[PDB]
Amino acid sequence: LMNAYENTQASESRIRDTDMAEQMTSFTRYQILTQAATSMLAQANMKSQSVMR
Amino acid sequence: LMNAYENTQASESRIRDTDMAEQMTSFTRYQILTQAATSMLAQANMKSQSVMR
Amino acid sequence: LMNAYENTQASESRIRDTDMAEQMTSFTRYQILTQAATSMLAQANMKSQSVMR
Amino acid sequence: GLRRAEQNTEDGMSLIQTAEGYLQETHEIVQRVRVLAVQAANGIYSEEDRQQIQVE
């Protein structure tokens, strides 16, 4: 019974628990795309004022 | 009675007392996730500052 | 029979048992290697933020 | 369940070991009467002696 618990827990651990190392790689990358899109959203609004002159 | 005392004391000890070895394993993992959750809550607060531009 | 048992257990020990002194060197090798890999993973996550200027 | 299953097998080991603790007591008593018997098969005992032995 003790042997099964450790084996079973690892079986469940792989399915449910996340790997924080590979998750931080994704989390950091999505921050920059959020930052990149926000700045390009700023320039999108400023793009309109060209015709005012 | 002494044989009864030993078997009964062992019986209740296994019921009520905690296994300290796996209790430290639980203590550390629940400690680590507290910090990981604390960091993401701090990050989530700063997530809303991007819209200021 | 005592002599045969002693020889057999000595033979069995050399096949199944492990060298604690030798395995500690291997254990320490991978422990340091993990710290180096963890260190560079953090550096690689911070690597891409430079493209934001 | 496997963690729960482990505990019951531990509790079951307690109950099994408990009963055998009493069985040890009886065997000590039964073997005392057994050795008490072989002294009462001796031929130099008066009726009061084998009556006194019987009381224990």
Secondary structure (DSSP) of B21-49: HHHHHHHHHHHHHHHHHHHHHHHHHHGGG
SS3 category, A4: helix
D18 contact B CB<8A: yes
Distance, in Å, from the CA atom of D30 to the CA atom of D36, rounded to the nearest integer, reads 10
Contact of A1 with D13, CB cutoff 8 Å? no
C41 contact A CB<8A: yes
> Residue B7 and residue D11: Cβ atoms within 8 Å?
no
Q: Within its chain, how far is the Cα of C25 from the centroid? A: 7
B52 contact A CB<8A: no
> Residue A32 and residue C45: Cβ atoms within 8 Å?
no
Contact of D56 with D36, CB cutoff 8 Å? yes
Do B and C have ≥3 inter-chain CB pairs under 8 A?
Answer: no
Contact of C29 with A12, CB cutoff 8 Å? no
Resolution of this entry in Å?
2.8
Residue with tokens 């997530």: B47
The token pair at C39 is 């260190």
Cβ neighbours of residue A36 closer than 8 Å, sequence gap 6 or more: C52
> Residue B51 and residue A39: Cβ atoms within 8 Å?
no
B36 contact A CB<8A: yes
Residue with tokens 């507290």: B34
Residue with tokens 């299953």: D5
The method recorded for this entry reads: cryo-EM
In this structure, chain B runs to a length of 53
